[PDB]
Amino acid sequence: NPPPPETSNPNKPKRQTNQLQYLLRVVLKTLWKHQFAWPFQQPVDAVKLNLPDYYKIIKTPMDMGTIKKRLENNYYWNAQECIQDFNTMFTNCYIYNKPGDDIVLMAEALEKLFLQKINELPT
Ligand SMILES: COc1cc(-c2cn(C)c(=O)c3cnccc23)c(OC)cc1CN(C)C
């Protein structure tokens, strides 16, 4: 498995815009709570899950635990950087798994909530 994604941005200002505050305290908070969040809260272990070619098809692994850490410890420069990671997480799932998979049905319910909160992004 690839090393876990970087979650610290050491030489960077400790300033969170209100949109990034929204991404943590509304978007992430609500998604993290969701019933189907648990398959997405940690990096995919392609070995233990026996996912052939997962890291061949998936060039940018991403997960909600990484996003949570990055939001919590000031990694993102701006909101769109964070929104892109959420999208990457959902994209990875949709391009690797099949439309009938439980994991895809769960991702779609999770993404519905994501999109709803993003539709209400302030400013
Ligand atoms: C963390 O453990 C799990 C991960 C996943 C999981 C997540 N993502 C994002 C995937 O793409 C994915 C792709 N294929 C197979 C599995 C997963 C999971 O699928 C419902 C179940 C568990 C529970 N386990 C005790 C088997």
Return the closest-CA partner of residue 109 out of 36, 24, 28: 36
What residue owns the CA closest to ligand 1's atom 7? 39
Angle of helix 64-72 versus helix 79-96 axis, rounded to 10: 170
Give me the amino acid identity at 115.
Answer: L
Question: Is 40 touching ligand 1 by the criterion CB < 6 Å?
Answer: yes
Flag whether 101 is in a domain. yes
Flag whether 3 is in a domain. no
Flag whether 6 is in a domain. no
Flag whether 12 is in a domain. no
Question: Is 102 touching ligand 1 by the criterion CB < 6 Å?
Answer: yes
DSSP letters for 26-65: IIIHHHHHSTT-GGGSS---TTTTT-TTHHHH-SS---HH
Q: Can you give the CATH number for the domain in which 65 is found?
A: 1.20.920.10
Q: At what resolution in Å was this solved? A: 2.1
Look at the chain and report how many structural domains it folds into: 1
Flag whether 36 is in a domain. yes
Contact 24, 86 (CB under 8 A): no
Positive or negative torsion for Cα 27, 62, 33, 76:
negative
Question: What is the C-alpha separation between 119 and 82, in angstroms, rounded?
Answer: 15
Distance from Cα 29 to the centre of ligand 1, integer Å: 21
Flag whether 108 is in a domain. yes
Give me the amino acid identity at 63.
Answer: D
Letter string b/e over residues 94-112, b meaning 16 or more CB atoms within 10 A of that residue's CB: eebbeeeeebbebbeebbe
Rg of the chain taking only CA atoms, in angstroms? 14
Flag whether 11 is in a domain. no
Contact 28, 63 (CB under 8 A): no
Domain that holds residue 89: 17-121
Dihedral pair phi/psi, residue 101, rounded to 5°: -70, 140
Flag whether 9 is in a domain. no
Question: Is 49 touching ligand 1 by the criterion CB < 6 Å?
Answer: yes
The helix/strand/coil state of 102 is helix
Say how many Å lie between the first and final Cα of the chain, rounded. Answer: 39
